[PDB]
Design a protein around this motif. Structure first.
Motif, PDB file in Angstrom:
ATOM      1  N   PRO A 159      -5.640   1.419   5.137  1.00  0.00           N
ATOM      2  CA  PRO A 159      -4.087   1.498   5.096  1.00  0.00           C
ATOM      3  C   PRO A 159      -3.896   1.288   2.839  1.00  0.00           C
ATOM      4  CG  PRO A 159      -6.196  -0.385   4.859  1.00  0.00           C
ATOM      5  CD  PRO A 159      -6.435   0.570   5.374  1.00  0.00           C
ATOM      6  N   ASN A 160      -2.603   1.043   3.483  1.00  0.00           N
ATOM      7  CA  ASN A 160      -1.959   1.010   1.744  1.00  0.00           C
ATOM      8  C   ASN A 160      -2.394  -0.029   1.122  1.00  0.00           C
ATOM      9  OD1 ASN A 160       0.101  -1.080   0.162  1.00  0.00           O
ATOM     10  ND2 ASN A 160       1.111   1.139   0.612  1.00  0.00           N
ATOM     11  N   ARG A 161      -3.401   0.304  -0.139  1.00  0.00           N
ATOM     12  CA  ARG A 161      -3.953  -0.754  -0.386  1.00  0.00           C
ATOM     13  C   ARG A 161      -3.060  -2.088  -1.218  1.00  0.00           C
ATOM     14  NH1 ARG A 161      -7.512  -1.061  -5.301  1.00  0.00           N
ATOM     15  NH2 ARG A 161      -9.756  -1.523  -4.466  1.00  0.00           N
ATOM     16  N   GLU A 162      -2.157  -2.131  -1.518  1.00  0.00           N
ATOM     17  CA  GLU A 162      -1.566  -3.422  -1.967  1.00  0.00           C
ATOM     18  C   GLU A 162      -1.392  -4.155  -0.877  1.00  0.00           C
ATOM     19  OE1 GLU A 162       2.270  -1.562  -4.675  1.00  0.00           O
ATOM     20  OE2 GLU A 162       1.803   0.094  -4.098  1.00  0.00           O
ATOM     21  N   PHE A 163      -0.668  -3.352   0.077  1.00  0.00           N
ATOM     22  CA  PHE A 163      -0.405  -4.221   1.313  1.00  0.00           C
ATOM     23  C   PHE A 163      -1.682  -5.446   1.788  1.00  0.00           C
ATOM     24  CE2 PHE A 163       4.155  -3.967   2.739  1.00  0.00           C
ATOM     25  CZ  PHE A 163       4.306  -2.641   1.382  1.00  0.00           C
ATOM     26  N   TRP A 164      -3.098  -4.574   1.733  1.00  0.00           N
ATOM     27  CA  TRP A 164      -4.549  -4.643   2.299  1.00  0.00           C
ATOM     28  C   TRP A 164      -4.657  -5.754   1.724  1.00  0.00           C
ATOM     29  CZ3 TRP A 164      -6.436  -6.716   6.831  1.00  0.00           C
ATOM     30  CH2 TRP A 164      -7.494  -6.918   6.793  1.00  0.00           C
ATOM     31  N   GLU A 165      -4.503  -6.028   0.100  1.00  0.00           N
ATOM     32  CA  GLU A 165      -5.566  -7.437  -0.443  1.00  0.00           C
ATOM     33  C   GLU A 165      -4.743  -7.894  -0.502  1.00  0.00           C
ATOM     34  OE1 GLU A 165      -4.426  -4.633  -4.426  1.00  0.00           O
ATOM     35  OE2 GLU A 165      -6.949  -4.664  -4.449  1.00  0.00           O
ATOM     36  N   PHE A 166      -2.963  -8.659  -0.048  1.00  0.00           N
ATOM     37  CA  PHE A 166      -1.845  -9.782   0.357  1.00  0.00           C
ATOM     38  C   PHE A 166      -2.851 -10.234   1.745  1.00  0.00           C
ATOM     39  CE2 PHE A 166       1.906 -10.855   2.340  1.00  0.00           C
ATOM     40  CZ  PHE A 166       1.547 -12.389   1.444  1.00  0.00           C
ATOM     41  N   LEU A 167      -3.032  -9.397   2.879  1.00  0.00           N
ATOM     42  CA  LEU A 167      -2.797  -9.506   3.977  1.00  0.00           C
ATOM     43  C   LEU A 167      -4.290 -10.546   4.503  1.00  0.00           C
ATOM     44  CD1 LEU A 167      -1.546 -10.472   7.412  1.00  0.00           C
ATOM     45  CD2 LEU A 167      -3.068  -7.913   6.938  1.00  0.00           C
ATOM     46  N   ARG A 168      -5.004  -9.638   3.437  1.00  0.00           N
ATOM     47  CA  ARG A 168      -6.383  -9.969   3.965  1.00  0.00           C
ATOM     48  C   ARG A 168      -6.515 -11.812   3.274  1.00  0.00           C
ATOM     49  NH1 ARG A 168      -8.545  -8.550  -1.662  1.00  0.00           N
ATOM     50  NH2 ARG A 168      -9.042  -6.053  -0.575  1.00  0.00           N
ATOM     51  N   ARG A 169      -5.919 -12.094   2.547  1.00  0.00           N
ATOM     52  CA  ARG A 169      -6.408 -13.333   2.233  1.00  0.00           C
ATOM     53  C   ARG A 169      -5.678 -14.230   3.272  1.00  0.00           C
ATOM     54  NH1 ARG A 169      -2.924 -14.742  -3.341  1.00  0.00           N
ATOM     55  NH2 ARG A 169      -1.086 -14.394  -2.275  1.00  0.00           N
ATOM     56  N   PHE A 170      -5.500 -14.044   4.149  1.00  0.00           N
ATOM     57  CA  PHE A 170      -4.975 -14.734   5.310  1.00  0.00           C
ATOM     58  C   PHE A 170      -6.546 -14.562   6.787  1.00  0.00           C
ATOM     59  CE2 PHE A 170      -1.032 -15.676   3.601  1.00  0.00           C
ATOM     60  CZ  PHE A 170      -0.737 -14.456   3.023  1.00  0.00           C
TER      61      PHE A 170
END
Ligand SMILES: O=c1ccn([C@@H]2O[C@H](COP(=O)(O)OP(=O)(O)O[C@H]3O[C@H](CO)[C@@H](O)[C@H](O)[C@H]3O)[C@@H](O)[C@H]2O)c(=O)[nH]1
Length: 412
Positions: A159-170
């Motif tokens: 996955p697009n690193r930038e986006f996964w680090e964000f969604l992952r917090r959920f």
């Protein structure tokens, strides 16, 4: 945040499948649903219209209902600017490391989630399931009192690193994360709290229900398909990596020894998917004026019920994907008793039992061999098909799907 209340498959209840799975299985099912009798099992997502996820819930919720569980389905409301961002989130999560996640987007996303969360107190239910990214952020707008499940319907190996680090917090919050295949499970998560759950097909839907010979023939005569000559078929979206051009090579090589063979390239695609409609144009250009090749798509009026016909009318089904998700199309084919020939990729390697229910080939010339084998030996073909049908009956049916969930709730 709206709600389902109604449905479309109707009042689907485990009973409507009794004939398909036998009474021992309907029983084995009801059992696992007594220990969860009168409980809360809510589902949340982006839409109840477009999508397979939606098509699955329309049959799955009623089903859970009729077995003793107070299932219920709520959807999410939002402006075009919310879906477009999610459309991005989506393709960002499935690779494409060229998209940029910005605060404007993050704020919008989280806000939409904060709002739709002030309509129904999700934390009040015994169990909560959130489908796909769009509503993942809900889990932090209520205080957990019950397990929360995150269901993923896309790939997450690259996955697009930038986006996964964000969604992952959920996502890291939820009690269990559910993926179609053991390759979509991001390392950032705890493999101990992860669940592999292949999707499934609903035997009684438009796409998989048994049509009557006459309707099949009408649909056939409509798109100029001769049911009296052999037919090979590949149902799939039109993109550069589904092996569509290889299938064309295969159809041509086979056609040398069997001059009557017909190739069916079937595929429904949204009108806002240029990428898809460009590979579509490319295909027609490559096929040239060989009208023994039928390109069937929704543009010309092909839909679930027509696709149903096309699969049933086929002698052999192909799936030469080069990169694939789970591959429900391989599943539908197997359900209709068809031997499939395909590449060892994603879900296709897991569904096809090489040599038993179909064949896994490495290239087109090998795919050509087996197509001729099967065409020449129908009884063998019929065999592989029967087995393939059983495999699905026992593994990838919407009831075995549910029973899988029931297993997940008794394991909490
Ligand atoms: O032209 C088509 C394409 C799909 N289908 C239906 O879709 C299902 C097959 O889907 P597959 O073709 O199996 O879907 P994928 O290509 O594997 O979807 C991949 O790509 C999706 C995003 O586009 C992700 O969400 C999925 O997780 C990922 O597996 C079948 O049951 C069909 O009913 C059609 O009827 N016609």
């Amino acid at each position: 945040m709206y709600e389902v209340k109604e449905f479309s498959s109707g009042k689907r209840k485990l009973e409507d499948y009794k004939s398909i799975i036998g009474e021992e299985e309907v029983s084995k099912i009801q059992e696992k649903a007594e220990k969860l009798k009168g409980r809360s099992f809510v589902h949340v997502n982006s839409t109840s219209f477009g999508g397979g996820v939606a098509e699955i819930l329309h049959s799955l919720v009623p089903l859970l209902r009729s077995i003793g569980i107070e299932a219920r389905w709520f959807v999410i409301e939002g402006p075009t600017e919310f879906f477009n961002v999610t459309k991005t989130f989506h393709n960002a999560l499935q690779g494409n490391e060229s998209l940029k996640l910005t605060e404007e987007m993050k704020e919008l996303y989280l806000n939409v989630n904060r709002e739709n969360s002030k309509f129904i107190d999700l934390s009040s239910f015994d169990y909560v399931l959130v489908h796909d990214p769009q509503p993942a952020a809900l889990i932090e707008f209520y205080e957990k009192k019950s397990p929360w499940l995150w269901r993923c319907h896309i790939d997450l190996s690259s996955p697009n690193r930038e986006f996964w680090e964000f969604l992952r917090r959920f996502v890291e919050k939820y009690d269990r994360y559910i993926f179609h295949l053991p390759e979509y499970v991001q390392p950032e998560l705890d493999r101990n709290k992860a669940v592999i759950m292949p999707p499934s097909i609903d035997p009684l839907s438009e796409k998989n229900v048994e049509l009557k010979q006459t309707e099949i023939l009408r649909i056939l005569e409509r798109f100029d398909v001769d049911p009296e000559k052999p037919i090979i078929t590949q149902v799939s979206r039109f993109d550069p990596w589904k092996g569509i051009f290889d299938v064309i090579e295969i159809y041509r090589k086979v056609k040398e020894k069997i001059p009557g063979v017909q190739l069916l390239l079937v595929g429904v695609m949204a009108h806002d998917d240029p990428e898809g409609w460009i590979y579509f144009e490319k295909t027609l250009r490559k096929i040239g004026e060989d009208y023994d090749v039928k390109v069937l798509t929704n543009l010309i009026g092909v839909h679930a019920r027509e696709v149903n016909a096309f699969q049933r009318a086929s002698d052999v089904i192909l799936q030469m994907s080069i990169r694939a998700g789970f591959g429900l199309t391989v599943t539908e084919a197997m359900w209709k008793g068809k031997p499939v020939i395909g590449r060892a990729v994603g879900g296709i390697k897991f569904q096809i039992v090489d040599g038993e229910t179909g064949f896994l080939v490495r290239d087109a010339n090998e795919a050509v061999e087996v197509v001729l084998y099967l065409l020449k030996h129908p009884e063998v073909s019929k065999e592989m098909g029967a087995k393939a049908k059983e495999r699905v009956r026992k593994n990838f049916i919407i009831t075995k799907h549910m029973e899988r969930y029931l297993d997940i709730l008794n394991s909490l």
